[PDB]
Design a protein around this ligand. Structure first.
Ligand code: DHC
Lengths: 121, 121
């Protein structure tokens, strides 16, 4: 769910998840996808394409188990859908941290309705 | 559109509109409505109920004319729908400023999917 996703992003990046990524670019946080603005945005692009296959559970609302072990996100044992969900979230958290170097605050509260349509996943 | 709305909010409050009100509570900013969390949130509740009475214009993307005269938002003539839209946005901007006293930062980046369903407008 959003709780686990936010904790992952915080653990990896060290930044307030909602504040930095809740409305970043055309892809991060709320709503769907758009053409990515930068690398950080593209993380969330891959993120939401990863969600697409999870038709068996709710990426926003369904809780799952994971642990923070030796500064590594370790997805606990779940059902297939929740396990993949956890992996989706882990991947975007890592990706967001990897791309902090080009994080641009002008995208932080990006006006998403004016984003160009995204390619099919 | 979001541009005029954000500017109105800035002119009244005068806080960063996207930052304070882009994701506030269950009603402010993105997505639809939820059961309001406080007075600020209820401003946006009324705000979105106001949008439902519009007849063919796009609240998010349609530009319209207005001016900031003697520190008062004054909606330009435009066309009937755009003027109604402009009055919707003026109303929420004033209301947001009126309720700054009880603005709660805990709601600023509210996780909206866990909001309770709103009453019909
Ligand atoms: O982003 C932050 O870390 C805080 C920003 C901020 C800026 C002005 C305020 O009044 C406020 O409550 C919060």
């Amino acid at each position: 769910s959003l709780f686990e996703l936010g904790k992952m992003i915080l653990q990896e990046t060290g930044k307030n998840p909602a504040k930095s990524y809740g409305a970043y670019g055309c892809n991060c946080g709320v709503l769907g996808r758009g053409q990515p603005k930068d690398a950080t945005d593209r993380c969330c692009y891959v993120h939401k394409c990863c969600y697409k296959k999870l038709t068996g559970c709710d990426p926003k609302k369904d809780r799952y188990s994971y642990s923070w072990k030796d500064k590594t996100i370790v997805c606990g044992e779940n059902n297939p859908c929740l396990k993949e969900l956890c992996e989706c979230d882990k991947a975007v958290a890592i990706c967001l941290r990897e791309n902090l170097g080009t994080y641009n605050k002008k995208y932080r509260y990006h006006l998403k309705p004016f984003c160009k349509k995204a390619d099919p996943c």
